[PDB]
Amino acid sequence: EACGYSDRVLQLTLGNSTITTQEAANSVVAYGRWPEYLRDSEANPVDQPTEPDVAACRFYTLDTVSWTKESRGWWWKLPDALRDMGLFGQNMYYHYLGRSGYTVHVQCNASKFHQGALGVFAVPEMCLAGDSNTTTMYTSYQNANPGEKGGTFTGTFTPDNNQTSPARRFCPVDYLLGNGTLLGNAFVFPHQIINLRTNNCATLVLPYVNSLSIDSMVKHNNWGIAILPLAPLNFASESSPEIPITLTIAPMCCEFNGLRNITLPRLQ
Amino acid sequence: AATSRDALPNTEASGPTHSKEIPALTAVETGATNPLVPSDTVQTRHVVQHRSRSESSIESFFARGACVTIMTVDNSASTTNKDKLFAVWKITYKDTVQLRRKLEFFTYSRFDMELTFVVTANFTETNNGHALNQVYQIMYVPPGAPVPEKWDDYTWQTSSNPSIFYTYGTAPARISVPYVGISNAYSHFYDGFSKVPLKDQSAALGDSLYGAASLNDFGILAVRVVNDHNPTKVTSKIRVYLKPKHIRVWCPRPPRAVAYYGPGVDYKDGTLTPLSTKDLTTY
Amino acid sequence: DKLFAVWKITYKDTVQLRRKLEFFTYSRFDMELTFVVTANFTETNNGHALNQVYQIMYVPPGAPVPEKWDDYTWQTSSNPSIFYTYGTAPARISVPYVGISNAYSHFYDGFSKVPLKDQSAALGDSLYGAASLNDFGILAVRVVNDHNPTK
Amino acid sequence: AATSRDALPNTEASGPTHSKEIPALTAVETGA
Amino acid sequence: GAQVSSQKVGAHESTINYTTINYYRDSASNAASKQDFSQDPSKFTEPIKDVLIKTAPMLN
Amino acid sequence: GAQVSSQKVGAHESTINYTTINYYRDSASNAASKQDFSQDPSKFTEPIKDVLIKTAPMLN
Amino acid sequence: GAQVSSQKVGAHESTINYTTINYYRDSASNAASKQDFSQDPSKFTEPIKDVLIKTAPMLN
Amino acid sequence: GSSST
Amino acid sequence: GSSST
Amino acid sequence: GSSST
Amino acid sequence: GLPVMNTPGSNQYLTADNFQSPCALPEFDVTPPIDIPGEVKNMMELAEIDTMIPFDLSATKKNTMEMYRVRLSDKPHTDDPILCLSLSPASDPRLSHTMLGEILNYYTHWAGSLKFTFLFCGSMMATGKLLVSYAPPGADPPKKRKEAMLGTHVIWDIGLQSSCTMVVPWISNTTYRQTIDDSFTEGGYISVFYQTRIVVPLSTPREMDILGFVSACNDFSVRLLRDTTHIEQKA
Amino acid sequence: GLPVMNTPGSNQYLTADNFQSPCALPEFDVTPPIDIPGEVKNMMELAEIDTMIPFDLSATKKNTMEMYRVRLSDKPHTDDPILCLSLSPASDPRLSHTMLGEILNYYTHWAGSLKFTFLFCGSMMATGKLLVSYAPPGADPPKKRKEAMLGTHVIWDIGLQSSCTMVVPWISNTTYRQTIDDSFTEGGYISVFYQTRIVVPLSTPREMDILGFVSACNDFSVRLLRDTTHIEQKA
Amino acid sequence: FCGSMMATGKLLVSYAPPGADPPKKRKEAMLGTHVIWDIGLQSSCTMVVPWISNTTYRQT
Ligand SMILES: CCCCCCCCCCCCC/C=C\[C@H](O)[C@H](N)CO
Ligand SMILES: CCCCCCCCCCCCC/C=C\[C@H](O)[C@H](N)CO
Ligand SMILES: *C(=O)CCCCCCCCCCCCC
Ligand SMILES: *C(=O)CCCCCCCCCCCCC
Ligand SMILES: *C(=O)CCCCCCCCCCCCC
User: Fold this and answer.
1) Buried b (16+ CB within 10 A) or exposed e, K23-59
2) CATH class, A1-268 region
3) Contact A32 E47 (CB under 8 A)
4) In sequence order, which residues have a C-beta less than 8 Å from that of residue F11 and are 6 or more positions away?
5) A90 touches chain K (CB under 8 A)
6) For residue G10, what are the domain limits?
């Protein structure tokens, strides 16, 4: 635009929160569908829904992780990563049912002299593979759900050989996208790439996706966020560079049904 | 209104170019694929395109019966340490690999299911003897109905369960079933658990398998030889073929790249090297 | 092992239809295939076999050819198969004009490879008059039944 | 004219209430 | 109740048609019509918020 | 003498119809149409002589 | 969707006709109509650039 | 001839 | 319906 | 009666 | 003859099929119907009739008349449950044998709203307020009034209208639930508490029974017909 | 009865047939669809999405993340190839596992135009010009820029538009190619060269990666459905 | 921002209305009114502290 508007410079405002960026690579709307509230013709639970609106549909920043030459990748699940985030988390644990869309904003700046590229993927039903070759489908609820800290990918599959006290955790191998399919094909999922010379962030607007209009947020994650180094971090001639990666995520058009007493999960 | 059997777009003739229009240059970071066609980067002639994508419509891609299981039954005398063998199979497409991999190009699906049954029998013992033509009963028992415990017990009465009585040597049996899911679509992947572990509850009590939803998702097929036994032993097998008709699919996925290892997405050590050696600058 | 059969689809293994088609250089047609199936006992013994079912699987160039009568390829999720019951009417299917050219070539005066000077003779070599090595694929046929004591 | 395959009645939206209308209270002795 | 549709004719020897009658009350019993629609790949190939013009810079 | 009715279509790939011809003189030989009616449960759920208004006291 | 054509009648006992309905979507499944055309042999029998008049000298 | 339902 | 040849 | 597609 | 090609399914017998077949008694003079009272058109009509719940299946009360009686008394207020029940209408032992439970055991799937009605059978002189609760699944099942109050509930005041109804609204993730015990399609928790206490004057019984009934609402339906486990035939 | 004559094909089971058959669950109440995002109507839609190429299948890089990275450096100009690839999208080991390659392995025949897009992942300070080439088959496969330039090509200038696309136009003798290695239906040669050289200032990495993607154009189609060799089930 | 053009960074500027523990960690500050500032050519960034008060005027 001759008034200066740019593909690269954006402002997102949800609730009492605003994100600015000056080095964006446009932004993605997954499957071309913007988030929406549940329509009457698709509705299923009959009780009046709660719609917390600005109290929950706002940007929550998770703990910042660190990208280094040895990093194999990171993953998070939604809504799990937001289970402890203000009134969104509260609404989630107080209700049997809940649905939500999200704006995901991944942040990672560096310099004109650094290089590297992060693949940022939003995967519907991101089922990951377990650490076991003695029992399949054995990852425990506690290990499947890290909350905001997320998990990581590994370059090596290593089977849990403790049969007495199994680890019961995932063992997500990076080139196999943590799920037995090739990473080079993850681009069929809604994605952006943070290539440090080009941009310093990724923005993905995710609709609620499921085979149901609404479901148990506590039992089921709708989306997975997978961040993998497609091209490794590098800087000048330093052997041990580091740059931070920050995740900020906002729920959108979230509504809840089936109010009762609060859920108190076994998370450890 | 564009149909699957319509011809694809014609190539339009294009000549030399020298401008500020830059189709070839792009930025994959955006998450988009550059929509180019040959006339954007080379000189083209006019071609009237007749080819179509008719055979790769979702319906056409799936319009085939695939074997999902082999059930074994026999017609032997039940004796104190061993009974006449009837078969019980939990309905699924995950016991075999080929249809499973095709459905798993997608996250969710809706379809009407066509099941076709191929039935073959043979003698197992040496003796001369004979058997007369067998009739088979394929009974569907849905989650909650009494599963048969003996080849001849009351459950084979089927007052409400659907059964097929198939006569050996006649055309393979076939039935259709509608979209029977308890959700708006079948989930090929469920990133969740069927139970929330509560703190106030024992770990055992809150536990459940990762990625599993209803323990008896679709029920069972129970198959038996209806005939009484012969002096001679005859073993039979029922091969089940599944075809998804009237199908819709959502959310594409990368296909399975390493061997299947159970009903989930798990993989086995030693099978994780799909790709083969090939040098970067070797054609 | 139990014997299953594999045949490279062609009209050139027999002579009569071949000679008729070869009155012409090129052709287009829809192909109708009909299958007549006959069985017999080979050993002397008395015994018996129950009625056989046969699987005729089409495997097109590139699909896994079966190595054993009972391996995973007979699952046929995508290849077309006919399950034929012994003693019923001969099996039959139709196929459209499936050529990768605008017509079938009954004669191809050429090679599938150009021998280049910068390449070894072995590397540039190919049979005279042959085009695609696996032109139309194979039919793989098996008896689906398990074995009898009698052959 | 209501057929076996007709959809069942829609749920109508309803809000808070404070009145002499007492749907919840009843008397099963009546046989109803 | 017969449905008459046209065939797309491949090899040739007007429009040739074929006939179909459904014999059963349940649509699940029907054969597949194969009369399917195509859609544009955009939701997967161009999921970006701002419409892409291919001759223009993707980043401006 | 063909009877043409519509199917209620569940999973999808206009109105789809199906055809039925009765081949026999005796109605007992016919298939079941499954075109059935529903009725209100009142004769069992509210068999009371005085019409029940649910917002009112059942006993007045 | 029925196609009604005439038979050429050989031995006799009006026009006698026969009926054909295509049962399948793919034209490849159809029977052969045998309603074929003839052409003149000229492209093989007289492929010469200058039209031949048979009463005239072929070489002039 | 035909009846329609 | 019908075609005539 | 008949439908045409 | 007309050229025909036999398709798969030929000569099979599907017990759920729906074909014509020849009549063995041609031109039989059928007796006309008469207008018998009580005609039923759909099994859900029966599911909408209230039937009584066998709540107290203790070892000594089960399979006796006592199983239908829930004993209350005029004891001091407590926040402890009078009764606790799982909303698994075909599989919980207290619901599976009600008319609703029985019909649901001939089907694989159920959906819709239900309602529980309680009848107070103490003397006219007895008064009391009770809290009837429905907690949708996913949290700790209520064992104290404190938790039960936070879910769907009705505070019942005992008086001339002898009975009170709590509607269990259809609140589910899936569009239909399974008619067996299944965690994925679990329905949640029904419970009853003392809101104040039962109070009686002198010369009055200090203990009494309440009876409970369950029935389906007009939005309730079932599907996928199946055999029941509620009857068998050994030998 | 109506006189009929059974034809060949009678009683067979063709797995590709398309017939009606009886419904085992008559009058079943089907759950309606909801508008789930991401519906696909044709497998070629997936083939038009860019997926990343495992170019470097060396013994130590294959089956690791490194296989997707093509290393460049600021070395002096050479006319020697950065990479060489055969246009055999279903059978060349670098293309056969891409999403396009995978879908093509369920079909016998492919036709149409393709496009390769490369992404430069060095620092902003790094500059360079590269030549991306497509040589239709029939001559010596290009091993020097001199030959590669004579075919279809794009000279890529590295800058703010991070990526560059070369379209491989449909140029074939046959109307469809086979999805296996076949000389008669061979597609030719894809290659990449240094046009000038990568140049960096001081304090900058002298080596970096480019990533490559392949996808189909709107004129691309496949036919003759078949099983893939890319999955098996031993025992 | 008064660093060099070569310096980059993202900062979070926060406003927490009164009544809870004053934020000493980003975790708490994020939950209130805030702006995530990306450093670049637009040198400066503004957070608006919206009038959020119990009383109609505050004391000075
Ligand atoms: C007389 C024989 C009747 C046979 C009736 C079978 C009815 C049950 C059909 C179940 C449908 C299975 C569909 C495939 C599997 C699921 O889609 C996946 N696990 C995803 O949910
Ligand atoms: C279930 C059985 C399916 C069988 C399908 C067979 C499909 C393949 C048909 C190939 C067509 C062969 C036509 C004859 C040969 C060629 O015309 C000549 N070599 C000339 O090119
Ligand atoms: C519409 O269908 C009216 C025309 C009827 C044409 C002839 C029907 C052929 C036999 C149909 C049997 C129906 C199967 C229950
Ligand atoms: C009404 O039925 C007029 C139309 C007739 C349509 C074709 C009938 C198909 C064969 C019917 C046989 C009747 C069985 C005794
Ligand atoms: C045009 O076909 C309208 C007239 C229909 C005449 C009766 C058809 C007889 C049965 C046709 C079955 C079609 C096979 C799928």
Assistant:
1) eeeeeeeeeeeeeeeeeeeeebbbbbbbebbbbbeee
2) mainly beta
3) yes
4) B110, B111, B112, B178, B179, B246, B247, B248, E27, E28, L30, L33
5) no
6) 1-60
Measured CA to CA, the distance from residue J5 to residue E2 in angstroms comes to: 11
- Mapping DSSP onto H, E and C, the string for chain C reads CCCCEEEECCCCCCCHHHHHHCCCCEECCCEEEEECCCCCCCCCCCCCCCCCEEEEEEECCCCCCCCCCCCHHHHCCCCCEEEEECCCCCEEEEECCCCCCCCEECCCCCCCCCCCCCCCHHHHCCCCCCCCCCCCCEEEEEECCCCCCCC
Under a CB-based contact definition with an 8 Å cutoff, are residues K174 and K185 in contact? yes
Q: J4–E2: do the CB atoms touch at under 8 Å?
A: no
CATH code assigned at F5: 4.10.80.10
Please give the residue range of the domain that contains residue K11: 1-235
Where are the alpha helices (H) located in chain G, listed in sequence order?
A: 42-45
Residues 6+ apart with CB under 8 A from C94: C30, C31, C32, C33, G26, G28, G29
**Of C59, C102, C132, which is closest to L185 when you measure between CB atoms?**
C132
Q: Judge contact between A200 and A106, C-beta under 8 A.
A: no
Under DSSP, is residue K103 helix (H, G, I), strand (E, B) or coil? helix
CA-to-CA distance for K11 and A53, rounded, in angstroms? 61
Q: Are C30 and E10 in contact (CB under 8 A)?
A: yes
* Chains contacting M (3+ CB pairs below 8 angstroms): A
Domain of residue L82, CATH code:
2.60.120.20
The C-alpha atoms of residue A152 and residue A227 are separated, in whole angstroms, by 9
Q: Which two tokens stand for residue A171?
A: 């063992």
Tally of structural domains, chain K:
1
Measured between alpha carbons, how far is A245 from B92 in angstroms, rounded to an integer? 42
Mutate which of D6, D14, D25 to disrupt the F interface (most F C-beta within 10 Å)? D25
Residue type, K84: C
Residue A236 region by backbone torsions, left for phi larger than 0, else alpha for psi between -120 and 50, else beta = left
Q: Which chain C residues are within 8 Å of B101, Cβ to Cβ?
A: 77
Q: What is the DSSP track for chain A?
A: -TT---TT-EEEEETTEEEEESS----EEGGG----PPPTTT----SPPB--GGGTSSPEE-PPEEEETT---EEEEETGGGTTSHHHHHHHHHEEEEEEEEEEEEE----TTEEEEEEEEEEET-PPPBS-SSSSS---HHHH--GGG-EE-BSS------SSS----B--BGGGTTTTB-GGGGGGSSEEEEETTT-SEEEEEE----SSSSB-TTTB--EEEEEEEEEEEEETTBSS-EEEEEEEEEEEEEEEEEE-SPP-B---
> What is the CATH classification number for the domain harbouring B269?
2.60.120.20
Residue B138 Cβ contacting ligand 1 at under 6 Å: yes
Are A113 and L46 an interchain contact pair (Cβ–Cβ within 8 Å)?
Answer: no
- Strand order through the sheet with B163-167: B87-90, B220-225, B135-141, B163-167, K13-14
Distance CA K98, CA K89 (A): 9
Neighbouring subunits of I (3+ Cβ pairs under 8 A): G
Residue L235, judged by CB atoms within 10 A of its CB (0-12, 13-18, 19+), counts as exposed
Q: Counting ligands in written order, which one lies closest to the CA of residue B238? A: 1
Number of domains in chain G: 1
I in contact with B (at least 3 C-beta pairs within 8 A): no
Token representation of residue L157: 């200038």
Which residues, including other chains, have CB under 8 Å from residue L65's CB and lie 6 or more apart? A72, A155, A174, A175, A183, A228, A229, A230
Q: Cβ–Cβ of K218/D25 closer than 8 Å?
A: no
Alpha-carbon span F44 to F41, nearest angstrom: 6
L70's enclosing H/E stretch is: strand L70-73
